[PDB]
């Protein structure tokens, strides 16, 4: 039962053995029942972590490759190693994507959950776009944008920016516009419009939501300065 | 070629994911070459980290198990036993490599590989069960003994290997044998012997020797306390 797998997931977290935490909540996905926000958060942490480890690896190898571009055979081998990372990273992403697409997004009833998963689909397609090239990149970027926009157009109706999942969307969506669409003016305009829509109510937030909101808004604000700089 | 394997190991180190590092340095070693001190250090970094993540996990999971008051505790146990079987598999994977290739092959090299054997038996000893817990610790103390003899005869007390013996061997004594007196004797001997060369140390190994001695000093404080 998934009730056991929830504890198995928490166990796999505390060990820093996220692969098992993901493998648990993945089978919690295949239950077809609607995840509670606790499970949703666990699954997010799980695959965000498992991908993050490969993202960090990939960026490191990618940098090492670009540092040594004159080095011939060992540059070739560094590329072979790098691709031997990328294929892992991609497999993890296609996993989580198909899991969202065939269970969670089909099921998600809450506007909040709809937003969260449509965001998350966007994110993981971005993490693929960061990897991909060519028409693969084109298609993945397109479907990431589609997923974000679908979430964005929903959350704009369904959530104030006083709720952190909307800010999390606005942050990640803006990072997508800057980092992947190469659209820094679009990125800054999106980020700023989200932030100042948050400023308009920034003092109305509840005890946790203000912490959560402030924790995100400081990233919105700092990205805004990073990009305006 | 060994060189491209060593390079892929280095690359995996730089990427900071070590299982492919260890799994390459293994097949570097199966050539039966004497690992030079660089690939020797890479092999240690690799297997040490690959075990160290499991060690951390095990400590965490054992703590959670102790913090249990059920499927809950059973599950905590079953995950622990998975971790332990991983850690055992990896240690066996190292120890057989040393016995088959490395320990079969200089005093420094002898001492390094023998210490390493000792430590991997010690990390089994953290996890071991049944009467063979004795045979594990025995084979560790056997390796450390051959190491301590070779180093006390053929390593100046400046040598960081010779101190790494005493330090780990004392951790074995205190954590595995609960014999703080046995630990502190060897530790103080090594510490003061290094101080007999405190200014004779090499320009880098000053920091090495003093860091090893700081850890000696702190755990000497523990085991005397």
């Amino acid at each position: 039962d998934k009730n056991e797998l929830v504890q198995k997931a928490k166990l796999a977290e505390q060990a820093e053995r996220y692969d098992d935490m993901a493998a648990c909540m993945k089978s919690v996905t295949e239950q077809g029942a609607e995840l509670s926000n606790e499970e949703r958060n666990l699954l997010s942490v799980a695959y965000k972590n498992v991908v993050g480890a490969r993202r960090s690896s990939w960026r490191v190898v990618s940098s090492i490759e670009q540092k040594t571009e004159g080095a011939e055979k060992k540059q070739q081998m560094a590329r072979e190693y790098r691709e031997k990372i990328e294929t892992e990273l991609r497999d993890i992403c296609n996993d989580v994507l198909s899991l969202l697409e065939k269970f969670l997004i089909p099921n998600a009833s809450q506007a909040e959950s709809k937003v969260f998963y449509l965001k998350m689909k966007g994110d993981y397609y971005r993490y693929l776009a960061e990897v991909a090239a060519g028409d693969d990149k084109k298609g993945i970027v397109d479907q990431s944008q589609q997923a974000y926009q679908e979430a964005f157009e929903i959350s704009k109706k369904e959530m104030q920016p006083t709720h952190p999942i909307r800010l999390g969307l606005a942050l990640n969506f803006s990072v997508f516009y800057y980092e992947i669409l190469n659209s820094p003016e679009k990125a800054c305009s999106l980020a700023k419009t989200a932030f100042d829509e948050a400023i308009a109510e920034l003092d109305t937030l509840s005890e946790e939501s203000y912490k959560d909101s402030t924790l995100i808004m400081q990233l919105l604000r700092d990205n805004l300065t990073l990009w305006t700089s | 070629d060994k060189n491209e394997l060593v390079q892929k190991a280095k690359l995996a180190e730089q990427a900071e994911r070590y299982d492919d590092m260890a799994a390459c340095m293994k097949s570097v070693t199966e050539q039966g070459a004497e690992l030079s001190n660089e690939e020797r250090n890479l092999l240690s970094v690799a297997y040490k980290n690959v075990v160290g993540a499991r060690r951390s996990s095990w400590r965490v999971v054992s703590s959670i198990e102790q913090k249990t008051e059920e499927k809950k505790q059973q599950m905590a146990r079953e995950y622990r036993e998975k971790i332990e079987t991983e850690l055992r598999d990896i240690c066996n994977d190292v120890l057989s490599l040393l016995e088959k290739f490395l320990i079969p092959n200089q005093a420094e090299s002898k001492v390094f590989y023998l210490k390493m054997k000792g430590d991997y038996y010690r990390y089994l000893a953290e996890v071991a069960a049944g009467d063979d817990k004795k045979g594990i610790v025995d084979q560790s103390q056997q390796a450390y003994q051959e190491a301590f003899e070779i180093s006390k005869k053929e390593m100046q007390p400046t040598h960081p290997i010779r101190l790494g013996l005493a330090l780990n061997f004392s951790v074995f004594y205190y954590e595995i044998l609960n014999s703080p007196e046995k630990a502190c004797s060897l530790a103080k001997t090594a510490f003061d012997e290094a101080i007999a060369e405190l200014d004779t140390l090499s320009e880098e190994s000053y920091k090495d020797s003093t860091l090893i001695m700081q850890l000696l000093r702190d755990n000497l404080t523990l085991w005397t306390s």
């Binding site: 994110d123 999390g168 942050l171 990640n172 990072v175 800057y178 980092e179 995100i216 990233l219 700092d222 990205n223 990073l226 | 250090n41 240690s44 970094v45 040490k48 790494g164 330090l167 780990n168 951790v171 205190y174 954590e175 860091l211 090893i212 850890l215 702190d218 755990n219 523990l222």
Partner: peptide, 11 residues
């Protein structure tokens, strides 16, 4: 007890 040793952003 112890022993021997060996700019963008998102959500």
């Amino acid at each position: 007890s112890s022993s021997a040793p060996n700019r963008s952003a998102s959500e």
